[PDB]
Amino acid sequence: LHKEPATLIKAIDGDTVKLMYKGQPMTFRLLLVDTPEFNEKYGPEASAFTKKMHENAKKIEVEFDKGQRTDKYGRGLAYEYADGKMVNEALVRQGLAKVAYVYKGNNTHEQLLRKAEAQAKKEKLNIWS
Ligand SMILES: Cc1cn([C@H]2C[C@H](OP(=O)(O)O)[C@@H](COP(=O)(O)O)O2)c(=O)[nH]c1=O
Numbered sequence: 001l002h003k004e005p006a007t008l009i010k011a012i013d014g015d016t017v018k019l020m021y022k023g024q025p026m027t028f029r030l031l032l033v034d035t036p037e038f039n040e041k042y043g044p045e046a047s048a049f050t051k052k053m054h055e056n057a058k059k060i061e062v063e064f065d066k067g068q069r070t071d072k073y074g075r076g077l078a079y080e081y082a083d084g085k086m087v088n089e090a091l092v093r094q095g096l097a098k099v100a101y102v103y104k105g106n107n108t109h110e111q112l113l114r115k116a117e118a119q120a121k122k123e124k125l126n127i128w129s
Pocket residue numbers: 029030031032033034071072077101103
């Protein structure tokens with residue numbers, strides 16, 4: 001896998017964001033995770049967390065996996081990095097997302113994220129409290 005550039009257009013919620021990629025506006029859905037919807041518990045905090053991560057970042061990158069790059073809704077499916085830090089992993093590690101939607105062939109970072117989730121559960125953070 002490799003990182004490719006992108007720039008923030010707009011924060012959306014815990015696991016979606018509007019980015020410019022190859023000069024086109026795209027909604028991205030973060031691979032292998034599920035945040036609560038904004039109207040759910042830990043939704044607002046998940047959204048804040050991802051927004052803060054985007055807005056503090058000097059450099060946003062996206063990384064496609066080996067499979068499908070777009071979902072059925074036209075959302076880009078990627079791992080996102082903010083200043084080299086994976087937003088998908090940071091959400092899990094903080095108990096603001098669950099590992100989810102692990103489809104065969106787009107699951108390169110599954111075990112990295114499961115390790116983060118096990119630590120968040122251990123610490124009883126947020127979703128796991
Ligand atoms: C994360 C992800 C979601 N999706 C689709 C499956 C789910 O379909 P349904 O909409 O039919 O439930 C939906 C979940 O995304 P959200 O959690 O953003 O709703 O997005 C994929 O197809 N591939 C993926 O990698």
